[PDB]
Structure formats: C-alpha cells, structure tokens
Amino acid sequence: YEPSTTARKVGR
Amino acid sequence: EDVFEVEKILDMKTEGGKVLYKVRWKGYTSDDDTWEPEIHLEDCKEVLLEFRKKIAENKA
C-alpha cells in the first residue's frame, strides 16, 4: 500500500 | 478538480497563517507550477517527506 501520489489542483 | 499526479514540492510559504506549497506536476513543465493549499497534499506523504529532507540538508 503506497501513498496517494495525487492531489487536486485549485491553483489551475 | 480533475486531480493530477504530483512529482514534487518545489517550495513553501505562508500567506497570513496558512501554509501553501508550490507544486511541480508530473508530466508538466515549470510553466504549470501552482501554489496549493496544504490540505491538498496531506495524503502525499512520500512527497512531503522528500521536501522536508531537501530543506533540512540545505539549512545554512
């Protein structure tokens, strides 16, 4: 099991 | 917000009392680096750890 590695981008 | 693959954190800052991180998105150039609120990366611990190190080994 590995970390998310992804994130949402609000800065766009 | 679609959600994208994070390569690494380039730097950090605080705007008032809030923490922000400049993010380098995997597969994108630096022209696409964005400042993101801390909560957006809390589950990216591999990335957060690698940034903590990079700054510790640079502390002059």
Swiss-Prot record, chain A:
Which tissues show it? Highly expressed in fetal tissues, skeletal muscle, heart, peripheral blood mononuclear cells, kidney, and at lower levels in placenta, brain, liver, colon, spleen, small intestine and lung.
Q: Give the subcellular location.
A: Nucleus; Chromosome; Cytoplasm
Q: How does it assemble?
A: Heterotetramer composed of 1 DNMT3A homodimer and 2 DNMT3L subunits (DNMT3L-DNMT3A-DNMT3A-DNMT3L). Interacts with UBC9, PIAS1 and PIAS2. Binds the ZBTB18 transcriptional repressor. Interacts with SETDB1. Associates with HDAC1 through its ADD domain. Interacts with UHRF1. Interacts with DNMT1 and DNMT3B. Interacts with the PRC2/EED-EZH2 complex. Interacts with MPHOSPH8. Interacts with histone H3 that is not methylated at 'Lys-4' (H3K4). Interacts with SPOCD1.
Q: Which disease is it linked to?
A: Tatton-Brown-Rahman syndrome: An overgrowth syndrome characterized by a distinctive facial appearance, tall stature and intellectual disability. Facial gestalt is characterized by a round face, heavy horizontal eyebrows and narrow palpebral fissures. Less common features include atrial septal defects, seizures, umbilical hernia, and scoliosis.
Q: What is known of its domains?
A: The PWWP domain is essential for targeting to pericentric heterochromatin. It specifically recognizes and binds trimethylated 'Lys-36' of histone H3 (H3K36me3).
Quote the function comment for this protein: Required for genome-wide de novo methylation and is essential for the establishment of DNA methylation patterns during development. DNA methylation is coordinated with methylation of histones. It modifies DNA in a non-processive manner and also methylates non-CpG sites. May preferentially methylate DNA linker between 2 nucleosomal cores and is inhibited by histone H1. Plays a role in paternal and maternal imprinting. Required for methylation of most imprinted loci in germ cells. Acts as a transcriptional corepressor for ZBTB18.
Protein name, entry field: DNA (cytosine-5)-methyltransferase 3A
Q: Which organism is it from?
A: Homo sapiens
Covered residues, full protein: 40 to 50 of 912
Curated annotation (Swiss-Prot), chain B:
Q: What does this protein do?
A: Heterochromatin component that specifically recognizes and binds methylated 'Lys-9' of histone H3 (H3K9me) and promotes recruitment of proteins that mediate epigenetic repression. Mediates recruitment of the HUSH complex to H3K9me3 sites: the HUSH complex is recruited to genomic loci rich in H3K9me3 and is required to maintain transcriptional silencing by promoting recruitment of SETDB1, a histone methyltransferase that mediates further deposition of H3K9me3, as well as MORC2.
Q: Organism's domain of life?
A: Eukaryota
Which residues does this entry assign to the site Interaction with histone H3K9me3? F4
Included range, full protein: 56 to 115 of 860
Query: From which lineage does this chain's organism come?
Result: Eukaryota, Metazoa, Chordata, Craniata, Vertebrata
**Record PTM:** Phosphorylated in M (mitotic) phase. Phosphorylation by CDK1 promotes dissociation from chromatin.
Q: What is this protein called?
A: M-phase phosphoprotein 8
Question: For the modification Phosphoserine, which residues carry it?
Answer: S30
Q: How does it assemble?
A: Homodimer. Interacts (via chromo domain) with histone H3K9me3. Has the highest affinity for H3K9me3, and lesser affinity for H3K9me2 and H3K9me1. Component of the HUSH complex; at least composed of TASOR, PPHLN1 and MPHOSPH8. Interacts with DNMT3, EHMT1 and SETDB1. Interacts with MORC2; the interaction associateS MORC2 with the HUSH complex which recruits MORC2 to heterochromatic loci. Interacts with ZNF638; leading to recruitment of the HUSH complex to unintegrated retroviral DNA. Interacts with TASOR. Interacts with humanin.
Q: Where in the cell is it found?
A: Nucleus; Chromosome
| Region (Histone H3K9me3 binding) location | 25-32
- Could you tell me which cysteines form disulfide bridges? none
Query: What does the domain comment read?
Result: The chromo domain mediates interaction with methylated 'Lys-9' of histone H3 (H3K9me), with the highest affinity for the trimethylated form (H3K9me3).
Gene name, Swiss-Prot/TrEMBL: MPHOSPH8
Q: Which residues form the Chromo domain?
A: 4-60
